Amino acid sequence: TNPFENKEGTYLVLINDEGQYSLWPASIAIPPGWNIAFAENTRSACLDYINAHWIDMRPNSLKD
Amino acid sequence: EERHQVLKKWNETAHPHPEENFLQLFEKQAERIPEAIAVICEDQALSYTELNQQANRLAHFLMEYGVGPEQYVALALPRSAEMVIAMLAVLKTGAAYLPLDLDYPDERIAFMLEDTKPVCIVTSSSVQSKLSHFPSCSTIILDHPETEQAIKHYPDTNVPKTQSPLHPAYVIYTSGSTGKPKGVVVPFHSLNNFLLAMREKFALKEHDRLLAVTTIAFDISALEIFLPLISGASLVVAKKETIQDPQALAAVISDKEITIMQATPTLWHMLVTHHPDCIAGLRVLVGGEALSSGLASALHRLACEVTNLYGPTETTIWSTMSPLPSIGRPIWNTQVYVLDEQLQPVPPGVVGELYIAGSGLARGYLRRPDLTAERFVANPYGPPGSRMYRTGDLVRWRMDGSLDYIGRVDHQIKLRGFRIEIGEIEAVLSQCDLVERALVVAREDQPGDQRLVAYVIPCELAELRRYVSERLPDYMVPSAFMVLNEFPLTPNGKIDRKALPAPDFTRKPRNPQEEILCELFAEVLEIPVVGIDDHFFELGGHSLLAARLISRIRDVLGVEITIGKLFASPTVASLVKRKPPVKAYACKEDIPLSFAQRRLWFLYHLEGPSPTYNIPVVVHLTGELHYQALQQALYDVIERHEPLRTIFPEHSRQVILEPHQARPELMIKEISESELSDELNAAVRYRFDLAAEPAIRAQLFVLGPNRHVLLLLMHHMIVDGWSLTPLTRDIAAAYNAHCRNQKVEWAPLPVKYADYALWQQEILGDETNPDSLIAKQLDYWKKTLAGLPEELELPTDYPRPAESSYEGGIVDFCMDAELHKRLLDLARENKASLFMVLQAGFAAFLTRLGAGTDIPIGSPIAGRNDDSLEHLVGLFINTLVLRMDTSGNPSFRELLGRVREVNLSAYENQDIPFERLVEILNHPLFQVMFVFQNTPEPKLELQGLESRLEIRSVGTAKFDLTLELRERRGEDGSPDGLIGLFEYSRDLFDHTTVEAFAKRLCQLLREVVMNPDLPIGQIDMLLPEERKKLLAAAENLYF
Ligand SMILES: *P(=O)(O)OCC(C)(C)[C@@H](O)C(=O)NCCC(=O)NCCS[C@H](CN)CS(=O)(=O)NC[C@H]1O[C@@H](n2cnc3c(N)ncnc32)[C@H](O)[C@@H]1O
């Protein structure tokens, strides 16, 4: 099964410099230029965090 | 190690933009070649200057309106130059456009609008009615004279390009089977990178033209529209009406001198199969689905420069491409990553999931953070903070910088525009109590034709198809079922397709409507003949062909059918689906005559025994004939079909005799060949005493030890034209069963003819009920056939005598195949059937001979709408009175329209006996008969015998004048001509006169074929032999 498609697993919410959010499997090493916005939790909770925080989906390069 | 190669070496795709937008390229082009042709659509054409200027004015207009970046404007426009101008202008203003295709359901468009929430909707007057707009935004109508004049008061100069490339350029929606569509927000620089890449790929000199056939609802259109414009090429935009019809599209590709074209494998298969000639020098772009290796083998041969394209919407149109399943290397600024389940790269040859990264990536899904974060994930192999998009496709690195496609992770296969889940198919297919295992796989019997084949392994026949179809959609049921021993394997450990058995690759219409529908199905599916119980989607029928089918149905029968109803009813018999079914009836005290029979019995009770309605089946048999087998066969088929052993005494009732009761006889006489005609002429003219004798006689004539002539003399009381097929099939069944000494294979009859009679009477018992269907149809006929003329006035040689001699003659005539084809083409081109065309020609023919402006002509109907009456041997034939009006001196076209209306109106009231109408109103209602035969003549096909069957003439005339036309089809299925005959009353006409009637009729047909707009009063009605003498007289007069 796909690393992200797994429902019964631990996940993470990584945030970008551009303010772009990304789900991430807790087991896999975090890429460079990505910080943890939401710590180890259920996939559903992670997606809820993403839904509740990533309001404006345009890059911060446009925000001023 | 080697990880450097699959990450860096094969992804060496990096070009810095030369500070040039695709828009700016277009503007520079407009400055360079001002009078060059930019866009052609139908008749109209635009230059680069005109296009650019109008786009600029519209841009300044929309800019003044208050439209800017991060704002969407809906494009509810028709496929035209106006949409090009529109989207181009919107791109110029810096905003994004929401492409709307109005053919889509209102719910989905409303969903797009309510979700996107655009500032304003621009539209045309042609479409503005289709929009039930929300009060969230205003609607600008570009056609409106006020708006149109307002546009022209704005500069036609270029606009400043000081915009950010991160702002959206457009938004495309996709249904990912989630249940709710997602808005893919594509940023500007992605589109720019793509278009620049494709511009670099294809040279596209000024002489090139591109035909756009994809709707704007998909990103592909952006290639089909902007790519020729950034080059010096022209763009031919095609309307949907052209895309649906293959003969029209293929005509355009040649008539517009198209150089390059992009489409889905489905459309390409639709063209290469039947119209290869147009793709001779065409540059082909394939994408959207896995290209069949046969289709590609066809394209690479016929066409040239065939390039396979690949990419999801989330990476803006196409991400990878390769000339000719290789999806090839990525394009500009596109990194491809083949990863495992731990997000690690795999060495060449290893299968992994595909992740696409680079400048192609969209912003994400409009107002859908979760889905974006689900698929647009973090990228560890790119710049810090980059993102990948997981395709869900399994790919494998080829030997040299190429990618081989394997299949999706959801184990679904995309075929003919469908997302087919094979798993469910094999599941329900193996769920049968008599089925153990099963595998379904799409194979190609015809080049480019991918059909679903099911291979089954039974537990320790055709009903299985019914089991599968009653639980699955019609596009999922296999086109062929093959039982095998075991699934073979390849050395690589895979299922061998080549080691599997080769696929086999494989009723009749019961009323005019069903035959029209079958003709339409055959025309759309491009196959010669279809049946009443054939499935549309199993024969390669997809959504586009469904659309065209719906159109043609709407124009030929005048009924609009939703495509959902077409999916729900994939067969004609389901489509036509009202008369109550014929259940089996209990033994009645007496059995009333069927209404078809009542007429004949009236004529018989009045005139007496006459050979007028005899049906003599004459069969020539060559070879060894087993007499006893034949006798037993006749006895058996008589035992099966009760009408063959029925008498009709006076009290008016049917009396079915027992098999042993009515002793059947077989006369055997040996004659010389030189008398075979004579004897036959006598034998056919036998007069049945219906009151006390079964109307059937069997007489075998012995010409030689191996040469025989079998005569089955029946009466129209118990047999019709249809019944002559299940009859002749049963006689052959029994015979061949006695020779092989095995039990006869028969299909049990659910109802008898007596049940048909009882059901008929039971139905007509509700004539009193005003709300009954029969009362309604009877009312219809009471109105339409009101005020019919007493009798027609044909040019008879002799005055109509008191006593009808009932002696008749026959004149045979033929119509060559070319003219047949021309008539068919006329029919299809003018929303009618060949039936209607021949009707029109016939009515015009009679009117021309002075039969009057109002001519009622009768035509027979099978009258077998119920499924239980399919194999019954009996009298079911009904007769419609088509009342035709030729007044007003109309064109053959207008007259054809009239006849069409009359026929279509008559078809909706066919469920009523002609006899009942005759009883209610006062030959009774029409003196002229027209019989049209489309089906082929029946045959015996006995074992070890050469059979030659013909229906002999009795020498009588059922009417004053009867025209019979039989359509013969070729080996291929192509028109092979028409065979017609005139059956005329001997006491009203001479042989010469009707012999001239034939010639005049044919000449009339050619006349109206050459010019359908010709008034029927101007049709030349003179024969060449007459013209010669006619000109000779004046030749002697004036000189
Ligand atoms: P009726 O019921 O009304 O509707 C059906 C109808 C035929 C009317 C309708 O589908 C139609 O008109 N079709 C429009 C054609 C169309 O939409 N074309 C798709 C272009 S979008 C996108 C490219 N940006 C292609 S994709 O969406 O199909 N990509 C998704 C998916 O496709 C697979 N794939 C794509 N390219 C492939 C190649 N070259 N080889 C193999 N597979 C390919 C891939 O799996 C990808 O994930």
Cα separation of the two ends of chain A = 41
Nearest-angstrom CA–CA distance, B275 and B290: 22
- Which residues share a beta bridge with B458? B435
B388 pocket-lining for ligand 1 (C-beta < 6 Å): no
Q: Which alpha helices (H) appear in B454-539, and where do they start and end?
A: 463-469, 512-524
Do A59 and B343 count as a contact with CB atoms less than 8 A apart? no
CB-based contact A53:A47 (threshold 8 Å): no
Of the candidates B191, B164, B140, the residue with the CA atom closest to the CA atom of residue B69: B164
Of the candidates B497, B451, B477, the residue with the CA atom closest to the CA atom of residue B269: B451
Of the candidates B430, B561, B572, B464, the residue with the CA atom closest to the CA atom of residue B511: B572
- Mutate one of A1, A2, A60, A63 to test the B interface: name it (highest B CB count within 10 A): A2
A21, A25, A26, A29: CA torsion to nearest 10: -90
Nearest-angstrom CA–CA distance, B429 and B481: 11
Nearest-angstrom CA–CA distance, B281 and B830: 33
Identify which of B218, B361, B542, B566 to mutate to test ligand 1's pocket (most ligand atoms within 8 A of the CB). Answer: B218
Domain residues for B434? 408-499
Token pair for B26: 């277009």
Q: What is the DSSP string of B650-661?
A: ----BEE--TTT
Nearest-angstrom CA–CA distance, B351 and B338: 8
Of the candidates B379, B444, B445, B386, the residue with the CA atom closest to the CA atom of residue B415: B444
SS3 B222: helix
SS3 B781: helix
CB-based contact B8:B382 (threshold 8 Å): no
How many other C-beta atoms can be found within 10 angstroms of the C-beta atom of residue B202?
A: 18
Pair (B484, B600) in one structural domain = no
Stated as kind and residue range, the H or E segment containing B39 is: strand B37-41
CB-based contact B342:B90 (threshold 8 Å): no
| Closest CA to ligand 1's atom 29 | B312
Distance (Å) from the C-alpha of residue A63 to the closest C-alpha of chain B? 11
CA dist B891 to B14, B388, B836, B900, B1017, Å?
68, 67, 15, 14, 9
Do B369 and A31 count as a contact with CB atoms less than 8 A apart? no
Do A23 and B377 count as a contact with CB atoms less than 8 A apart? yes
Residue given tokens 């009920």 in the structure block: B769
Q: Give the HSE-up count for residue B891: Cα atoms under 13 Å, Cβ half-sphere.
A: 10
Of the candidates B857, B879, B849, the residue with the CA atom closest to the CA atom of residue B789: B857
- Residue B617 carries which DSSP code? E
Of the candidates B871, B618, B876, the residue with the CA atom closest to the CA atom of residue B733: B871
Helix axes B48-65, B22-32, angle to 10 degrees: 130
- Give CA B825 to chain center in angstroms: 16
Token pair for B566: 């077409």
Token pair for B346: 């795999």
Nearest-angstrom CA–CA distance, B718 and B757: 12
Backbone angles phi, psi at B216, to 5 degrees: -75, -5
Do B367 and A57 count as a contact with CB atoms less than 8 A apart? yes
Q: Which amino acid is at B895?
A: L
A43, A44, A49, A51: CA torsion to nearest 10: 120
Nearest-angstrom CA–CA distance, B369 and B8: 31
Backbone CA torsion sign across B763, B595, B865, B467: positive
CA dist B201 to B14, B187, B258, B332, B739, Å?
15, 22, 19, 10, 73
Of the candidates B865, B855, B860, the residue with the CA atom closest to the CA atom of residue B880: B860
Atom of ligand 1 nearest to the CA of B317: 24
Which residues in chain A are closer than 8 Å to B371, comparing Cβ atoms? none
Q: Is B377 exposed, middle or buried (0-12, 13-18, 19+ CB in 10 A)?
A: buried
Nearest-angstrom CA–CA distance, B237 and B233: 13
Structural method: X-ray
SS3 A55: coil
Do A2 and B370 count as a contact with CB atoms less than 8 A apart? no
Q: Which alpha helices (H) appear in B380-529, and where do they start and end?
A: 422-430, 463-469, 512-524
Do A47 and B374 count as a contact with CB atoms less than 8 A apart? yes
Q: Which chain A residue is nearest to residue B370, measuring alpha carbons?
A: A47
Chain B residues 864-903 within an 8 A CB cutoff of chain A: none
Q: Which alpha helices (H) appear in B402-469, and where do they start and end?
A: 422-430, 463-469
Closest by Cβ to B409, choosing from A2, A13, A32 = A2
CB-based contact B722:B728 (threshold 8 Å): no
Nearest-angstrom CA–CA distance, B93 and B96: 9
Nearest-angstrom CA–CA distance, B837 and B892: 9
Nearest-angstrom CA–CA distance, B574 and B534: 10
CA dist B1012 to B787, B829, B893, B1007, Å?
30, 11, 6, 8
Indicate the pairing of strand B72-76 with strand B96-99: parallel
Nearest-angstrom CA–CA distance, B167 and B312: 20
CB-based contact B878:B861 (threshold 8 Å): yes
Backbone angles phi, psi at B350, to 5 degrees: -90, 135
Indicate the pairing of strand B878-885 with strand B946-951: unpaired
A17, A20, A23, A28: CA torsion to nearest 10: -30
Token pair for B369: 């953070």
Pair (B472, B606) in one structural domain = no
- Mutate one of B341, B370, B391 to test the A interface: name it (highest A CB count within 10 A): B370
Q: Give the HSE-up count for residue B251: Cα atoms under 13 Å, Cβ half-sphere.
A: 9
How many other C-beta atoms can be found within 10 angstroms of the C-beta atom of residue B1031?
A: 10
CB-based contact B141:B133 (threshold 8 Å): no
- What resolution in angstroms does the PDB record give? 3.1
Backbone angles phi, psi at B427, to 5 degrees: -65, -55
Nearest-angstrom CA–CA distance, B873 and B632: 18
Pair (B607, B710) in one structural domain = yes
Nearest-angstrom CA–CA distance, B691 and B609: 10
SS3 B679: helix
Of the candidates B715, B931, B664, the residue with the CA atom closest to the CA atom of residue B724: B715
Atom of ligand 1 nearest to the CA of B320: 39
Residue given tokens 């599916």 in the structure block: B525
Superfamily, domain A1-64: Structural Genomics, Unknown Function 30-nov-00 1gh9 Mol_id (3.90.820.10)
Tell me the CATH number at B738. Answer: 3.30.559.10
SS3 B174: strand
B614, B620, B626, B628: CA torsion to nearest 10: 10
- Residue B925 carries which DSSP code? S
Of the candidates B299, B282, B286, the residue with the CA atom closest to the CA atom of residue B223: B286
Nearest-angstrom CA–CA distance, A3 and B184: 23
Pair (B705, B596) in one structural domain = yes
B220 pocket-lining for ligand 1 (C-beta < 6 Å): yes
R_g (Cα) of chain A, nearest Å: 12
Nearest-angstrom CA–CA distance, B707 and B711: 14
SS3 B586: coil
* All residues at 6 or more sequence positions from A27 whose CB lies less than 8 Å from its CB, including other chains: A10, B342
Of the candidates B405, B337, B327, the residue with the CA atom closest to the CA atom of residue B6: B337
Distance B415 CA to ligand 1 centre (A): 10
Backbone angles phi, psi at B22, to 5 degrees: -70, -35
SS3 B411: coil
Nearest-angstrom CA–CA distance, B429 and B458: 11
Nearest-angstrom CA–CA distance, B303 and B361: 33
Nearest-angstrom CA–CA distance, B441 and B454: 6
CB-based contact B930:B963 (threshold 8 Å): yes
Closest by Cβ to A14, choosing from B363, B367, B378 = B378
Token pair for B987: 């006491």
B263 pocket-lining for ligand 1 (C-beta < 6 Å): no
Nearest-angstrom CA–CA distance, A54 and A31: 20
Stated as kind and residue range, the H or E segment containing B980 is: strand B975-985
Tell me the CATH number at B441. Answer: 3.30.300.30
B393 pocket-lining for ligand 1 (C-beta < 6 Å): yes
B125, B128, B129, B135: CA torsion to nearest 10: -150
- Which residues share a beta bridge with B437? B457
Nearest-angstrom CA–CA distance, A25 and B229: 45
Of the candidates B245, B172, B252, B266, the residue with the CA atom closest to the CA atom of residue B212: B252
Do B409 and A29 count as a contact with CB atoms less than 8 A apart? no
Q: Which residues of A touch B (CB under 8 A)?
A: 1-4, 13-14, 16-18, 20-25, 27-34, 47, 50-51, 53-54, 57-59, 61-62
CA angle B678/B680/B682 to nearest 5° reads 75
